[PDB]
Specification:
Bound molecules: zinc ion
Shape: globular
GO molecular function: metal ion binding; metalloendopeptidase activity
Family: Belongs to the peptidase M4 family.
Keywords: Hydrolase, Metal-binding, Metalloprotease, Protease, Secreted, Signal, Zinc, Zymogen
Largest sheet: 6 strands, mixed
Structural class: alpha+beta
Radius of gyration: 20 Å
Number of helices: 8
Cofactor: Zn(2+)
Subcellular location: Secreted
Oligomer: monomer
């Protein structure tokens, strides 16, 4: 008899600051079993799992007491809103929220499910938090989302940007299938960086145009993993398609389409939601697993035709990243 209930708690980190769910940001969607006054960091669309610094688990939801409808309860094991670690207030609060934003931006804004099953039923977003010991990564493994708590260089890696990034690697294999190498691998990596921006936009109405600044320790020298307005700021990512060479790792050939996306959403009468709508649809209906950068421009133009967007805004942008769409 687990029923809807409203979770109140804190999030953030020492760098971007600490904020309260139910004041600064929406209440969390939890479930509650009254007869035991136990609560669960789980709703229809998102399960948050507390790995407790282990490396394997059974993905039973994080479970916290909620003893004593506009009633709300405080999250965390000591029912005070906290699950503090390595400078973060409660990375598990931040996953539940991240899982929400991503599930909603995809379903409400684009009408599609971020995650679906083989047979087409939607697939519940499992967020595995506190994974490992001082783990400085977050990754997608086909079935679920794993976030490390970081170490000396980064705070725990639960944030809308990181979460949207890694989750949307699920969106790409169940749709376009953009292979994780070559040009398509850059496009894959790129799509996740766009989804990272779209999650920050759903949330607060503006976005970083960077990747990971919120998780980088403020005394770690680095301030951001990638810049999408000018990728080559990072020293190695490329800005235009003509700079490609087959030996780019995907996190550095991602600069092309990341630049493209920044250029498109900054066009007159464009916003982020419009530009990502094109990409979600191109990923959904036209992009091929072996896609070249030029084939991706065709997929975008074909998608915009399906949604009615302005094709000449698309082309100027493609043209600025030295992609040519002549043969589509
Ligand atoms: Zn990635």
């Amino acid at each position: 008899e687990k029923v809807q209930a409203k979770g109140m708690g804190f999030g953030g980190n020492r760098k971007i600051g600490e904020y309260q769910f139910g004041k600064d940001l929406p209440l969390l969607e939890i479930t509650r079993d009254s007869s035991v006054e136990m609560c669960f960091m789980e709703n229809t669309d998102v399960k948050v799992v507390d790995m407790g610094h282990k490396y394997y688990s059974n993905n039973k939801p994080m479970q916290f007491t909620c003893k004593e409808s506009t009633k709300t309860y405080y999250t965390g094991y000591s029912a005070d809103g906290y699950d503090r670690d390595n400078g973060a207030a409660s990375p598990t609060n931040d996953a539940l929220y991240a899982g929400y934003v991503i599930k909603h931006m995809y379903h409400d804004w684009y009408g599609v499910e971020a995650l679906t099953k083989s047979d087409g039923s939607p697939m519940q977003l499992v967020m595995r938090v506190h994974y490992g010991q001082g783990y400085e990564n977050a990754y997608w493994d086909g079935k679920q989302m794993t976030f490390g708590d970081g170490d000396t260089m980064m705070y725990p890696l639960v944030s809308l940007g990181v979460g949207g990034h890694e989750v949307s690697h699920g969106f790409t294999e169940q749709h376009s299938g953009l292979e994780y190498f070559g040009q398509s691998g850059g496009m894959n990596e790129s799509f996740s960086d766009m989804a990272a921006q779209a999650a920050e936009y759903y949330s607060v109405g503006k976005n970083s145009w960077q990747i990971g600044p919120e998780i980088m320790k403020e005394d770690s020298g680095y301030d951001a993993l990638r810049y999408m307005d000018k990728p080559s700021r990072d020293g190695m990512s490329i800005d235009v398609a003509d700079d490609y060479y087959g030996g780019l790792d995907v996190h550095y050939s991602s600069g092309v389409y990341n630049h493209l996306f920044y250029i498109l959403a900054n066009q007159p009468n464009w916003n982020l939601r419009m530009a990502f709508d094109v990409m979600v649809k191109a990923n959904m209906d036209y992009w091929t697993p072996y896609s070249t950068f030029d084939e991706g421009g065709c997929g975008m133009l074909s998608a915009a035709k399906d949604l009615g967007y302005n094709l000449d805004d698309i082309k100027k942008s493609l043209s600025e990243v030295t992609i040519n769409y002549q043969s589509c």
